[PDB]
Design a protein around this ligand. Structure first.
Ligand SMILES: Nc1ncnc2c1ncn2[C@@H]1O[C@H](COP(=O)(O)OP(=O)(O)OP(=O)(O)O)[C@@H](O)[C@H]1O
Ligand SMILES: Nc1ncnc2c1ncn2[C@@H]1O[C@H](COP(=O)(O)OP(=O)(O)OP(=O)(O)O)[C@@H](O)[C@H]1O
Ligand SMILES: OC[C@H]1O[C@H](O)[C@H](O)[C@@H](O)[C@H]1O
Ligand SMILES: OC[C@H]1O[C@H](O)[C@H](O)[C@@H](O)[C@H]1O
Ligand SMILES: [Mg+2]
Ligand SMILES: [Mg+2]
Lengths: 409, 514, 402, 516
């Protein structure tokens, strides 16, 4: 009955993603979660944030050790820049042994800047013995859940083939003069492939309940320099370097059914004139399913889902007629909503709301289950897939990735 | 009459008042500042036409939603929601310090969404009347206890949204801010749309305008209007309507894509297929998601303005209305009678003279929907014929005299039976339980029996003579023995008592000050 | 001048492609072309065809040798099954040395069943020293020419990226009981990759004026067995083997601008429900061009072309669709016209040479056997890429260093 | 007369002269005498440019230049048509007729002179199939050797005269010498003939070519039915009414420019009609037989607006006064609707004005004929159409006026209507050109009372209202044009070319056949 006490590294009232997503999600669940702790390298920032958001149950901690050691925390949320995850999480995990109450470690995607760091973080987290969560909140999108339902229940029959087209938003020819350099530089754990393809391709695996068998990728830097623009979109006459990718070609096969998947991710603008900028098109033996989005990345955007097919809540249908479904939620705020539904699932698990008679204390991964939430193991498997995308590009070869979902040590 | 009535201290209404005050106290350990009350409703006739802008014939009943409220003006402002029925788990949410609107997730069935949507429309209303006080600062927090004895099918969802909006306005404007019935009804009209149900304005209007011992004539066009009327005084008989609950599992939200919301879509497509066939254009409603592309009354008006001496829109005159609706039923026959099997998406597109893609964009993208065919014939026939039956019911109810008491019970009863037949065979919103209840009732003292509300479960109503010289107890006994004892053997004395109720028209929305 | 005299191998009045396409084209150009010769293994087939089509200037030849040696032929057209191209064309070319009048050899795509046979045929045709033509008639589609004009004249700026989606028609889960087995068995020079992807990817290269730098392909046989269906689409309860592919994934880069290209070719039915079955989407720095087709392979389909971009400084919108255009007959007809324009030098070019090696990316002229060979080398590399599990560098395949 | 007239000899001398010369050229070409000659005249439109495809009435006349198709019918085992042009820049064509009677394909993607013959042959073929199925269904048409000779200048409706002559020749060659060809059927089947060649034109030119007669202009109406009423120019006291035609000599390329010029105009006025209909909540009919306006036109809007909001008004049954009031109403609606968007509508704004998506707008208005644009000028195009139609009605009144005016009043008033029409074509419809504008100005300063382009524009021809007779201005205008335009822009024109650049025609006989 006691709220889950949350400690944040990276909640800042004046900027960042956590203030836009985690924070509003928590307000909606204020009997289930309470913010009790903040840590930032500058104490002033934590103090300013606690003031502005009136976080009356929160304490600003002066050091990582004091924060991580504190027994006032049940769940730690890491929402700082990915380039800082490893250097923060590793010592934190060790200090957190001083806290016998710690039950959850919740990290933003991407987990780390390289597979090696992801592997080390995962190992340390498993060693700590806490339930882990990764923010792959596309798995909690109502659109993704509905699609997963249709597929799993047999509405498209077997999957024949899949096409995916996405857009990375920032990696086109121009860059706003106010955009921060860090998302455009290699090694910072944020880029078209790791971040945007990351969310989208994991969404695909989740919806179809299959990992990949074989993959081939080509990664491009055809735009080594972007043109600075003002807010009105006018070029200011100055170029700046972009070392991260501006295009991704990916193709491969789903393990279940050897299903062909073709993907192209455009870096940014110009947007497409005659085609939606986000499309997931799934062709089955018995029906088709298509998800399209006008605005934004799959994991934070309001989509439309189209379905038509047959399997030839109980509805009385005619055997020789296609069923049509359209699924769109007009007033759905996906930026707040998908994260909110992720918190809801953490809450449901913690308080055992469904009252499932034998729900274990912890689970290693969500995998393709509807229930629960994605963990650091689901994150690690995604990192292994991203690594193979980069390796495939580097070696000029189609890679067998059929075993990346298996862990040994 | 203009404003929502306010009270301080119907022997039944006092008993509930104290009962909820103590439940609130038991939950929150303090006494509440006020109670917002909003009653359930039944519709005598005129089912599934309100979102087509046709007038209806409802009344408020003696069951209500009670929201006991303690105001808390201490940031961090938060709202705690407790229900007397423990199956609706307690919620608590902090108000945005912005004070921006709170998000609502329309993808799930959630009892607090109804409170949240009433809160939203109130919030928006408040920002319009008092921009300086409400634009950049949150609402007051509150502890709230919700208790309802409205059976499912009794317009509980709308009573709840009305009570929620009422509470939000009262808590933020203060003790002596008069709240308009007209405004309360206007702002709540679209409230449930935010939670995934594309309903009409009947239930909100009824809950707000209800009056003790009066039924209502509720109109939507040309203006929202609710006219109270008493049942006719008969020679030696009491007119009454008994409500029997089907006890069917409530899931309007989960089935909306194939049931409630599909119907609304079907009647909009029908109006536009008619307009296309007769070469008239319909208005584009931008105020309401019911029918952004025009509805069946818009078609009636458009047809008449083009072909009947450039006639002005129907103003609600009974005689004129019967005439025009009879014409409409003719056009439905000419237009759709050869397509009783229904229209596939391709056929509906053709009928509207557009592509499948454009059809999908204009009609299928507003609320989730799932179907093989759209039954334009059956759905339009229902709406036009049902609207016709309301006009007939109204002229009866407003007649000062009738040949005999029997004549009234038989004629009015017949209109109800026709309405039921139509809801069942044409609109397909009845169910086995409804059908069983009605037939039994009719065979045992009722003159007319029909579902009320959305259907697919819910409640049923029955025209029966009441009082020492009536059939009330004959009907009740027959239902208990032949229906309830059969289908639901385990019902407890109280449940059984609750499954069947006799209500007089009740007072509308009101506040109790503490 | 006198009409070009055409000799056909494979013109059959009762069936096949030539009768649907080449023949009606010649009728429309009856002053530029005349059919003077037919050859078929059964002389009765030629005689019947000559009779039924009233081919008054034509003779049925008894042997391949007598046909190929005949001086009454200026242009030989080969429109038989690809599986027979090599066994016919090789000795034909040699016999053809007895005909001093031979000026053109015209072959349907695909040229051969393997790259090796393609190379041998090309070498033999080059040595014979006659002008060659391949039927990559997508290069004469008005839709392709208009797109090529827009791109080459700068209307979309530099090309950022390209997506292609196609359908092979026959290689889904069901097969009509009347459908000939040979198009479903490997080694017959007819399949999703060789034929349909071939036409479409050559079209792309032509429209963008670029060959590929690097490619990777995955080739699928997820449907090793198809269900026989009657003409009404009902399954008859019997499966038959399919050894050719039912899917192709292809991705790579155009040499010109290192342009990313993503392709997916679906084998057959079911067709897509929410997307056109043929799409070529070209995204540029200054505009986009998209070609869509609801019916038919690109090289025989009536398409729609969409353009939007800038070259005042405001956005231009163009839609290009010809409602009454018959592309099945039309594209072939336009190929015949270009052969005729070349031959009679109709555009009055004072120093137009007598022969050319290849069209390449040129607007003028027509695709040759060299253009065909280069496409064969690309197709071979697609299959090799799949087999090796490798991203191949094919930047030099357009070089005939021999 | 109901049927196309047939002659074996002479009609003014001019006909037999041109007739003998084309017979000579045919003979020199084919080494045999032809069996018959299909003739169809060019035309000028006095007033009413670019409104025929909007279904508004026009005021044209056939002129004494024409298309002559001399034909020899062939008895062939392989039926074929050979087409030779008097002008060697139109190279000879020959094609075999499908032996099973199927239709020949037409490639609408290229400009080709024989496409006009082919589309005329196509509509005639389809007509032959309808009236004699059991004999044209599965058997080829008859072969022929054909020689084509036109002295119609570009802009004189040559393309339509040609299509009409081709269709006529095709019916005559296949039905024989004793088959009556009705003017009604001929005008009907050729109405949509050019649509097969890529040009989305109206029915003015075909109707004029067919319904022309000696010394009569025509009032041509399209709704509810095609109607052509001949009338003579008014008898003036001591001046004769003449229209001098002057060719701009601008390079002909209507087909190549159609996506930005002629066909775009047609799209703009359909879009304008539907934006008006949307704004005023009325539905337009769904034309199923003609590609001009499958979604309805500007006359459809006028009718639909009156049916909905003006039920009490008296009907318009070709009454001029009433017609004028309805058009003045339309002009008001155009101001209220589009006057704040004179910069034009982008594809997105047009879609919004029609209350649909860009995709549906594109499918519904932009995929019928190739088109290319930055904006659609709904205001200017609709303003032109309604005002131009109003000018036709006033012109008609003058031509058939009972109330009498001085000779000078006629010339000044009728000229003013022509001048207002030119200004609207130039500034509102944007279908003039520099050469047109220069010719019109020189003409007006040198004896013309009214000068405007005729035909589609973007080049082509111009017409000039001049007094002829004892003291007319015909020669005044000619010399000023030669000196001030032709010598200046085309210094190297032969005397022959100059003679042909400026002509004076009387109304001429419509389509006809010469036997032998
Ligand atoms: N006692 C309650 N308190 C608060 N919310 C309730 C209560 N009972 C039901 N609800 C909510 O209302 C929902 C039912 O809405 P529904 O509109 O179908 O009922 P209704 O208003 O009674 O029916 P109808 O509109 O046909 O008259 C339930 O799903 C639940 O979320
Ligand atoms: N002497 C000719 N004989 C046959 N065809 C001709 C001849 N001259 C021109 N043409 C053809 O007619 C086409 C011109 O069509 P166009 O409609 O623009 O002329 P028009 O009928 O005179 O003009 P307009 O319709 O504006 O009055 C040319 O492109 C060419 O194909
Ligand atoms: O008559 C049907 C009735 O049912 C629903 O529940 C709605 O709340 C009402 O607006 C009305 O549509
Ligand atoms: O008035 C313009 C005129 O010009 C064109 O060339 C057409 O052939 C006619 O139908 C007519 O539109
Ligand atoms: Mg309700
Ligand atoms: Mg013309």
């Amino acid at each position: 009955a006691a709220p889950i006490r949350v400690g944040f590294v990276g909640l800042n009232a004046a900027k960042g993603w956590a203030i836009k997503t985690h924070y509003p999600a928590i307000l909606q669940l204020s009997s289930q979660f309470q913010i009790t702790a903040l840590y930032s390298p500058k104490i002033e920032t934590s103090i300013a944030t606690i003031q502005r958001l009136k976080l009356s149950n929160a304490t600003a901690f002066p050091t990582l050790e004091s924060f991580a050691s504190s027994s006032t925390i049940d769940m730690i949320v890491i929402a700082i820049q990915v380039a800082s995850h490893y250097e923060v999480v590793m010592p934190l995990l060790e200090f957190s042994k001083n806290n016998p109450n710690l039950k959850y470690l919740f990290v933003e995607w991407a987990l780390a800047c390289s597979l090696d760091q992801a592997e080390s973080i995962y190992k340390a987290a498993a060693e700590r013995g806490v339930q882990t969560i990764i923010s792959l909140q596309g798995r909690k999108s109502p659109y993704i859940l509905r699609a997963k339902e249709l597929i799993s229940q047999g509405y498209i029959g077997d999957i024949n083939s899949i096409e995916i087209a996405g857009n990375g938003g920032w990696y086109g020819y121009e860059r706003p003069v106010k955009s921060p350099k860090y998302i455009y530089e290699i090694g910072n754990g944020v880029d078209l492939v790791t971040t945007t393809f990351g969310h989208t391709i994991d969404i695909l695996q989740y919806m179809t309940s299959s990992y990949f068998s074989r993959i081939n990728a080509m990664v491009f830097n055809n735009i080594p320099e972007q043109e600075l623009i003002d807010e009105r979109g006018n070029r200011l006459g100055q170029r700046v370097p972009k070392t991260v990718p501006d295009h991704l070609l990916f193709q491969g096969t789903l393990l279940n059914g050897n299903v062909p998947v073709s993907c192209s991710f455009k870096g940014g603008k110009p947007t497409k004139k005659f085609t939606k900028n986000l499309v997931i098109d799934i062709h089955g033996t018995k029906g088709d399913l298509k998800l399209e989005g006008d605005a934004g990345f799959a994991e934070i955007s309001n989509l439309v889902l189209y379905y038509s097919g047959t399997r030839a809540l109980d509805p009385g249908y005619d055997a020789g007629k296609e069923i049509m479904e359209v699924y769109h939620l007009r007033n759905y705020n996906a930026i707040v909503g998908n994260i909110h539904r992720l918190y809801q699932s953490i809450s449901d698990f913690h308080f055992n709301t469904k009252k499932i008679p034998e729900l274990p204390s912890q689970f290693v991964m969500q995998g393709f289950d509807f229930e629960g939430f994605p963990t650091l193991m689901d994150a690690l498997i995604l990192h292994r897939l991203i690594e193979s995308v980069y390796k495939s590009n580097m070696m000029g070869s189609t890679l067998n990735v059929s075993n990346i979902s298996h862990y040994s040590l | 009459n203009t404003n929502v009535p306010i009270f301080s201290s119907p022997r039944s209404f006092e008993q509930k008042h104290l009962a909820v005050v103590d439940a609130f106290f038991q939950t929150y350990h303090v006494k509440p500042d006020f109670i917002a009350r909003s009653p359930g409703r039944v519709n005598l006739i005129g089912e599934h036409i309100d979102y087509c802008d046709f007038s209806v014939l409802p009344l408020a009943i003696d069951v209500d939603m009670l929201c006991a409220v303690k105001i808390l003006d201490e940031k961090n402002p938060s709202i705690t929601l407790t229900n007397a029925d423990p199956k609706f788990a307690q919620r608590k949410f902090d108000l945005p310090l912005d004070g921006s609107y709170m998000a609502i997730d329309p993808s799930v069935s959630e009892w607090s969404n109804y409170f949240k949507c009433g809160l939203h429309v109130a919030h928006s209303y408040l920002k319009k009347i008092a921009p300086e006080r409400f634009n950049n600062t949150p609402l007051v927090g509150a502890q709230i206890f919700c208790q309802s004895d409205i059976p499912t099918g009794g317009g509980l969802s709308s009573a709840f949204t009305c009570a929620a909006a009422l509470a939000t306005i009262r808590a933020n404007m203060g003790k002596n801010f008069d709240i308009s019935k007209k405004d309360l009804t206007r702002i709540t009209a679209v409230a449930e749309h935010y939670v995934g149900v594309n309903n009409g304005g009947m239930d909100q209007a009824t809950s707000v305008y209800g009056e003790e011992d009066h039924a209502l004539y509720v109109e939507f066009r040309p203006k929202l209007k609710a006219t109270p009327f008493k049942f006719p005084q008969l020679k030696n008989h009491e007119i009454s309507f008994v409500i029997a609950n089907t006890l069917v599992k409530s899931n309007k939200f989960e089935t909306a894509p194939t049931n409630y919301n599909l119907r609304v879509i079907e009647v909009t497509v029908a109006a536009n297929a008619l307009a296309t066939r007769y070469s008239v254009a319909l208005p584009s409603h931008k105020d309401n998601s019911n029918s952004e592309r025009g509805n069946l009354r818009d078609f009636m008006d458009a047809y008449y303005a083009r072909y009947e001496n450039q006639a002005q829109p129907w103003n609600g005159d009974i005689g004129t209305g019967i005439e025009r609706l009879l014409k409409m039923l003719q056009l439905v026959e000419e237009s759709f009678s050869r397509k009783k099997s229904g229209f596939t998406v391709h056929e509906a597109s053709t009928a509207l003279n557009c592509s499948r893609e454009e059809f999908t964009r204009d009609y299928l993208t507003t609320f989730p929907v799932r179907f093989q065919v759209l039954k334009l014939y059956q759905r339009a026939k229902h709406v036009y014929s049902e609207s016709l039956r309301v006009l007939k019911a109204l002229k009866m109810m407003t007649s000062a005299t009738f040949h005999t008491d029997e004549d009234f019970f038989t004629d009015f009863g017949r209109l109800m039976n026709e309405s039921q037949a139509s809801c069942d065979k044409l609109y397909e919103c009845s169910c086995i339980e409804t059908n069983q209840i009605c037939s039994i009732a009719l065979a045992n003292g009722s003159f007319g029996s029909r579902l009320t509300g959305a259907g697919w479960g819910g409640c049923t109503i029955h025209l029966v003579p009441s009082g020492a010289n009536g059939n009330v107890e004959q009907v009740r006994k027959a239902l208990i023995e032949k229906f309830y004892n059969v289908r639901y053997p385990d019902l407890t004395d109280e449940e059984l008592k609750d499954a069947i109720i006799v209500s007089k028209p009740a007072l509308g929305t009101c506040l109790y000050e503490q």
